Each structure stands twice: as structure tokens, then as C-alpha cells.
Amino acid sequence: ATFVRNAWYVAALPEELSEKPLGRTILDTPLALYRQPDGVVAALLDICPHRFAPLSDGILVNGHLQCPYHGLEFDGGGQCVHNPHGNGARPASLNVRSFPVVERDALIWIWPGDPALADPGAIPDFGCRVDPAYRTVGGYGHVDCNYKLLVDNLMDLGHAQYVHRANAQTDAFDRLEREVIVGDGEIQALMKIPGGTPSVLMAKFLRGANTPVDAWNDIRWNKVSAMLNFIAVAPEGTPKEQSIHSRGTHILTPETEASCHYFFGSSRNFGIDDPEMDGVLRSWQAQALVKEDKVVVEAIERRRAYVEANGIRPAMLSCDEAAVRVSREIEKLEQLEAARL
Amino acid sequence: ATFVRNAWYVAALPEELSEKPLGRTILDTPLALYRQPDGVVAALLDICPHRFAPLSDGILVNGHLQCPYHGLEFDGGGQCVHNPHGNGARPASLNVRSFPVVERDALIWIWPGDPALADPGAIPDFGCRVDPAYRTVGGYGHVDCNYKLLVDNLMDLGHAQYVHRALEREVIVGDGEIQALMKIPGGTPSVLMAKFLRGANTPVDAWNDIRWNKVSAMLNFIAVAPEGTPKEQSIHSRGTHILTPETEASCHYFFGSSRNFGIDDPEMDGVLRSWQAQALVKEDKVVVEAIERRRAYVEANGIRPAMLSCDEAAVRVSREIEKLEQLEAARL
Amino acid sequence: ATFVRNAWYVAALPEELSEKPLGRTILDTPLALYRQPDGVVAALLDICPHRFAPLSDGILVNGHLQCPYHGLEFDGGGQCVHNPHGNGARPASLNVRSFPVVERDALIWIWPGDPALADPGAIPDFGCRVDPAYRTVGGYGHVDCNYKLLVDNLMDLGHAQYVHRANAQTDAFDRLEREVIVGDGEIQALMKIPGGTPSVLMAKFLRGANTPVDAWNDIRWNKVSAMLNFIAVAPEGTPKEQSIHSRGTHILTPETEASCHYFFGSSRNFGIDDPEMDGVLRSWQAQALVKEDKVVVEAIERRRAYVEANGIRPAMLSCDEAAVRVSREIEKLEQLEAARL
Ligand code: FES
Ligand code: FES
Ligand code: FES
Ligand SMILES: [Fe+3]
Ligand SMILES: [Fe+3]
């Protein structure tokens, strides 16, 4: 498959890991993810060096992952620390590949490429997720589509007007204002819906509304497939700087060429201590992302064979600039690698 | 896959369609089938021109199918009639492919191939389905086998449907049409059929013919009559047995019964609307799907079928389909 | 796929066959297996010569297998003996392929390759299965892995230490002494676990014993994938021969390139008339082979694509000599055949 391996990808949410290993495939690479006794997260190739058994099916012994087949034990670095057979020798050939991993902003980031090049400073900024001023809730979802389809989906938040009709439709959609900002390793799609009636969702954020209001749906894309949106609503002429909002985490990580992992979240500055508001945001993520965006994109993935078999290319609309620019940047990154090594 | 695209195929029964689009694949082509406000059926490629979303998952807006993803709207011709974005321009690139479709004889016919060759006059004749003198009931069925296996099944020397349990032979070959005739004077095993028996009494003649039309549309004739009456004045049923390829290894099966007896009798409708009693008994379904699973082995090896005396009709039909395949493939 | 067709493989256990045909695929070849009225087992290609229907879905008529589609009937030799259509002629083109089959040692052996080379004298010896001095119980299992993975598994009974720890664990495993015997078309791995307490299984063998014991785990491999192990346990310094033992039948037969049939059994010389002793062996078989072993190897099979895509080769340990020798012999046999056609 075609992937951009030299970049950080989210492999899991902190709460998904423990002393019991989690087996998950990232960029066609099977991984064994677990948290060691000292709390440090480890990510090993889920293939024992001996006979290829799944290390993820083993248990921790003295904080070391024990292969369930013949008992070899490994440390977080992939180093074999115990061989219960024969002279118990541990030659270098018994070490397993260990991947660079960094736990930051309540996310487990992994570098699937040359471990020597992993640069922590290149990890996208999702600080809001651990900011005490924000309330964050979210989850995980699996989708049977190429990750680029979801990136396209998120880079044109205008699809909410239809796919999420019941919760996001606005009567001022025809008055939308959009801008695209290209930076270094970052692209932004700004959108503002002026003087309209709050959508059913924004209304909930406002705990009941009717009077006109201004709403924004901006989104920031960072190298490969990590996005953070900005959904905000505020009366008439109230600047978005001081508006209530939700900074949404929308990060995709390729599983196989035709499937991907979707990590989503909401970091809001309103109704912080409201379990009901928590419910509103969780219901939306469940219906919108997992049970609406999934259907559209999975159906699109099923039609790929037909479109490719024939010479069908997509027809872009005025709302596609951002998505197209991001698509082109990912394509360039793919070409570089396919061309580098 | 190998399909004969230049021909009319049944895509659905009238009752299956409404203002709520039906998504169905025909010859590996996904279609969005729906009936417009004026009652006219439309068939569009189920792939939005914008980003390929399934139009069949959308709803009608002002009689126009609205894509569920970003709202583009299309008319029955595939023409984009509304773009809610930006200047709302509608360049030709936003139109979606529309397929020739004709509703006739209580069937929805579609032409999946070269649209320039789509000629309504070439649509097989199933007039009995809408003939007030006949009572028609039927349904739809899905099978996991290549459509040719079911065509072979139906063309097989008068094996009839379970419900039809019971001069001589004659196989007339025409242009895109083949007829397999069978008259059974007096007969031995049994001439009067379980379902027809209730009619008349005195000695009779029996008939079991089937007509095949270009590709995979068949209409059979199951009948019985006393002494030696006219074939057309007999107690009979004309069965609709039409296959439409879905993928190379699966197909749609549209079946029906047009009978001239017990017209206003509901007991008979129920059994004639049964898939296993009228189209394929479970035992036979297990067999064609099992045959499809053995295709790889037979092809990998040089295994060819050994024909028996009962295969003439099936073989002739198979050869005609093969010729049609070659014609199309030859072009490109 | 790559198979060694010129050799005898077990296609079924005697008890699995009757007048009701069994459809099973061996080396990617679908077969119809059944026992005729006179008790003789027949194996026909499960593809009717007429239109390819599954003969295995038919019934016997006058001892002849009747195709469920149009009624052609065949004898054990594959010869069409009845055509109910037209003049009822039976040309040679209506005969179906019949495979060499031999019922011996309570096993149904079939020859899937060149029929002119099938030699009954080449059938592996599993006489213990029909020896009145032994009590035999066993069964069948289907596994989604290449048969070679299970051959590797069995040629290193040491995995029992971890994969079956709850029932096979042993402390003396560290003082293990193993031998490797090579013979004409035969390889044996010897294992001796002297001085120590018996595992949960051995204790049941000795009907709850309370004495340090000497254990024995040997296994014999014969051409391709037929194995017979020797699990024994006896009061310390006791003649290994005169020990309480169970000769285990462990025979694999490839189904497809990534799946296989597993025939297992236990021929014991202790507790012959004990339905409960029968119960301990049956429970172990259910938990250890069909469950535990299955899980490990099916996971390994799923990782084959990754290991092949990359240049990953297995790292052998001191416990792999036997398995490696057997693997090399099978590879040679594969090369020979591929070298001919
Ligand atoms: S496969 Fe892991 S120790 Fe053998
Ligand atoms: S995919 Fe249909 S309007 Fe976008
Ligand atoms: S397929 Fe076996 S008799 Fe016709
Ligand atoms: Fe969405
Ligand atoms: Fe085992």
C-alpha cells in the first residue's frame, strides 16, 4: 500500500492501554501496545523474533512482555531479556523491533518509520485536550475506508449541512463565508455562518436559543492526517475570540489500504461540569462520526473499484479548495517516499 | 467480469420502487432506482459526480434525487439541476450517468451497455403479465451463483417448478430467441399437474414449453387440456423467469406466474408467490451455489462438462450467449 | 498453491464416514468420501462430470453415489453406472475421478497425486491405534493455518510449557535433555524431564500420584505431515519402556494453502476401561489442540503477509533442531515435485 511512514500517528487513546497488551495494526504494521509497571507505554512489532507468534496475546512478567508461545521475554525497548531455553543465551537476533512512542495531550503517538528520525518536536499540537480550562470527552471508531476519504470529509465541514442534517442544518448556509490559509506543514479551512438561527446542536450548546447568532466551523490540518476543528457560536456581533466553543480532535490513522482508525474528541470551554452536556457531545460523536460519516464514506470506498476500473475522476465544487490542497500535500508526501527509498 | 451489456435486463419489479431510492447492482454497475412524482421510473449510476457518494441513500427534493453528502440534485436524466455551493454553477461535469429504462409488462427493464444501441423494440415480450385475462403473482430472489447456471436450470428438459410437479420435443432457434417445445399426449408418469388437476377430468394432453430471449429472460408455458383441444384454449400458466447478473458470481432472479385459471382464488396466490415453490427449491439452490464454488478447480484443471441427452436446449442457449459476449468483446 | 501431491495423507477417521457422503477438501481438491454397503470406503472427486454439482450432497442408491442434480450414479471406481436420461448411454466421459484410498490403522489414507505411484507399503505405521492392548480415543479439528505451522508446533513439544501451562507446566523443564534421531524418511525428537513433580496431566495419568517422576515427550515424524508422539510418566528411576504411556496420533492434512485438517488421537496402555480416563484425554485434546494450539498458529498465519512482505526470517532456538530438520525435508520434497511438472 501507499503510506507516509515518516510522521507521527495516533495509535491509541491512553485509556485503551494497560498491562494487558492491545494488538492493533497501523500502516499495515501489527503492533503490541502496553503500559509498563512504571507507567511508560511501549510499542513493539507484534511478531515474536523466534517463530512470529503474537506478543500481544502474551502477559507481562516482571514488567516484561512474555511471548505466549515459547516464553521469550522483552523489555520496552524490544530487547530480549530472558530466554528460558538451553543455555538461555540471548543473541541480538532475538530482539524485536520497538517503535518510537510519545504520550502527550492524552494521546499515544507512534512513529512507524526510521526510529532514528523520530522528532518529538514534530508532534502536532493538541494542548487543549489537557488544558484544565477545557472539558474533554471522546472515543475511538473503526472504519472500512481509506483514511483519505475521512480527511476529505473533515476538510469540508460543509457536508454537515446534509449528512448531519438533523443536528447541524442552518438556515444561513447560503450566506457562508470561507477562506483557506496555507502555512508550513499546516492548512486551515475557515468558515463562518453569519446571522442565522442556531442549529439544533449549537442551540444545545446555548441551552436553548432562537435569536440570531454567528457560528464558525474552522479546521486545522497538520502533516498527514491529524485535524483539530473549531466549532463556535455567539450572538450577532460577538467576536469568535470570546465565543463559547468546542475544539474537536479528529485524527485518522491508516490500518490497511482500505481501513482506518478514527480518534475523535471534543474540548469545550462551556458547561465544563455538566454530565448532560457531556451526553450531548457523546451522542453527536456516536451519531455523526460513527453512525453517519461512516456510512457515507464506507459506501464510497465500496465504489472505488468501479471508479478506478472506469476513468472516473471527482468533480470539485466551490467548497473543496481546502480538501484539495490537503489531498495534494499528502500525494506529494507519498511520491517522495515511493521515490526516496 | 464477462457480461453481455448490450441487451435489456430486468432491474426490478414495479412494486419494489417508490420515491425512496433502491440501490441495486446490475452487471457490476451500482444503480439508484426510483419513481419520480409523475410516476416515471429513473435509473442513475449510484455514484455522485462530486465525491462518489451513494445517491440511492438520498431523498427526493421537488422530484429530484438529492445526494446525501453535499446536496447536489439531479433529474431523471442525470442532469444536475441544483448546486447549493458558491455561485451555484452547474457545469456539464456535474451530470451523472442515466440509464435507458422502460417499464413494460409489470417489469422494470434497463439497458446497461452502449446507450446508442438501446432500442425499446428489442425488449422481450411478456405481455401476459399485464393481460386482464391472466392473474399474475411473483417475486424476487437473490442467488450466489453465475446467472448462466440458472439459465441452464430453466432450459433443462422440462423440469418445471415444484408447484408444477407432474408431437414430442422441438427446439426452434431464432435470432436472439430460442424455443424449447414439449407436447405430452396422454403421458405416462402423469400429465395433469397437481396444481392444474382440479380442472376438467377426462383424458388430456399436456404441454411444457419455454421461450428464451437474448441473454437471460425466459417465459415458459405449462398446460393441460382434454382430448386434443387447441394449445391456446387449454388450462395454463405462463411463468416469468428472468435472471440479471449482479456480479460474476451472483445474480438477481425475478419470477412470476401468469395463469388463466382460478383467477380470483387467493389460496393459489400464496404458493405461486413462493420462491422455493416457484423458482428454486432450497436443495437446488445449495447445488448451483456449490457449483459456483467449484469453478476455480474446474478452470484450474482442464475440466469441461459432459453433455447428456437432456442438454440440447441449454447448450444452444449457452452458445448464443457466448456469441453475444464475443461480439461485444470483439469491438473494444 | 504448493503441495506435495505424491504421498499418502489422512483424509478422515473411520468413524467420520458412512453411507452419508462427507465432503472434504484435501490439497485444494474437493472429495466425496463414503463407505459402500460392503464396507469399502470410496473417495471420488466432488465434482459431477455432467454439470459439476457436489456428489457429496447426494445419497447412495443400490450402493452407488447418486448426483443430487440430475441423477447420474457412480460406483466406487468413479465409473458412471446409470444415466436416467435419453437412451441412457454411459460414455467414458461420464466417469468421475476416483482416488486411491486405503483404510489401515483406524485411518483413511488417500493418495492425491499421480495414481501410478501410489504404494500401500509406504503408508506410515500407526498400528497402536488398532492394538487390543491399547485404548484409543480421538477426533477431528479444522485450523485456519498452513499445515507446516502445526508440524513445527508438534516437532517442538516444548511449547506445551507455555501454550498449555495450566496443564503441562513442569519445573524440571530447565533440566530438560533432548535428542534428535534421523532416519530414512523419519525424524524423531526425544525429550526427557527427569526428577521432579509431574504436571497436571501426568498426575492424572498416575491417578493422582505423590512421587517425584521422570517424564518423556518423544515424537516421530514421517514423510510430509504424519506424527506419532510418546508421552510417558513413571516413578523416577524406572525403565522408560515399562512406563505408563500414551502414543499420540497427530496427523495434518493440508486443505488449502492457508488451512488444514488436524486428526488427533491417544492410544494409551493404562486405564483402558476407564470412561473417566477417556474423559481426561478428551478434555486435554479439546483444550490443548483444538483451542490453545489453534489460537497461536492461526495468529501466526495472519502475520505471514507482513513477514514475507518484509524480509523477516525466523530466529531458531536450541529447541528447534527437530522442527528445522523436518521443515527442510518437506521443502526438499516440494522442490522435487515442482522440479518435475
Ligand atoms: S514464537 Fe515467541 S518464543 Fe517462540
Ligand atoms: S458526493 Fe454528492 S454532492 Fe458531494
Ligand atoms: S450435475 Fe450431476 S447429473 Fe447433472
Ligand atoms: Fe461529519
Ligand atoms: Fe500443543
GROMACS .gro file of C-alpha atoms in nm, chain B residues 10 107 109 124-126 129 147-148 150-156 178 209-221 238-244 253-256 317 321:
model
   43
  351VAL     CA    1  -3.486  -0.662  -1.561
  448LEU     CA    2  -4.125  -0.521  -1.520
  450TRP     CA    3  -3.616  -0.305  -1.792
  465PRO     CA    4  -3.873  -0.927  -2.484
  466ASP     CA    5  -4.250  -0.979  -2.488
  467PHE     CA    6  -4.407  -1.060  -2.151
  470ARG     CA    7  -4.815  -1.016  -1.713
  488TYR     CA    8  -2.662  -1.640  -1.385
  489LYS     CA    9  -2.577  -1.894  -1.656
  491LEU     CA   10  -2.988  -2.072  -1.353
  492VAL     CA   11  -3.041  -2.027  -1.728
  493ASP     CA   12  -2.914  -2.387  -1.772
  494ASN     CA   13  -3.151  -2.495  -1.492
  495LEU     CA   14  -3.455  -2.334  -1.656
  496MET     CA   15  -3.374  -2.458  -2.007
  497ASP     CA   16  -3.331  -2.815  -1.879
  519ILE     CA   17  -3.495  -1.990  -2.878
  550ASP     CA   18  -4.253  -2.526  -2.342
  551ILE     CA   19  -4.013  -2.247  -2.263
  552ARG     CA   20  -3.904  -1.944  -2.464
  553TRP     CA   21  -3.561  -1.787  -2.420
  554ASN     CA   22  -3.478  -1.434  -2.532
  555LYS     CA   23  -3.140  -1.266  -2.574
  556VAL     CA   24  -2.924  -1.321  -2.271
  557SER     CA   25  -3.136  -1.444  -1.981
  558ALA     CA   26  -3.510  -1.371  -1.999
  559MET     CA   27  -3.744  -1.670  -2.020
  560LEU     CA   28  -4.119  -1.732  -2.035
  561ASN     CA   29  -4.247  -2.087  -2.002
  562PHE     CA   30  -4.579  -2.249  -2.088
  579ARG     CA   31  -4.703  -1.870  -1.829
  580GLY     CA   32  -4.410  -1.839  -1.594
  581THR     CA   33  -4.180  -1.540  -1.585
  582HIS     CA   34  -3.821  -1.649  -1.513
  583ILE     CA   35  -3.578  -1.367  -1.567
  584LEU     CA   36  -3.218  -1.354  -1.449
  585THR     CA   37  -2.999  -1.047  -1.421
  594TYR     CA   38  -3.391  -1.377  -1.007
  595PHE     CA   39  -3.730  -1.229  -1.097
  596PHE     CA   40  -4.005  -1.489  -1.113
  597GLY     CA   41  -4.376  -1.484  -1.170
  658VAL     CA   42  -2.872  -2.106  -2.537
  662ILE     CA   43  -2.489  -1.608  -2.507
   0.00000   0.00000   0.00000
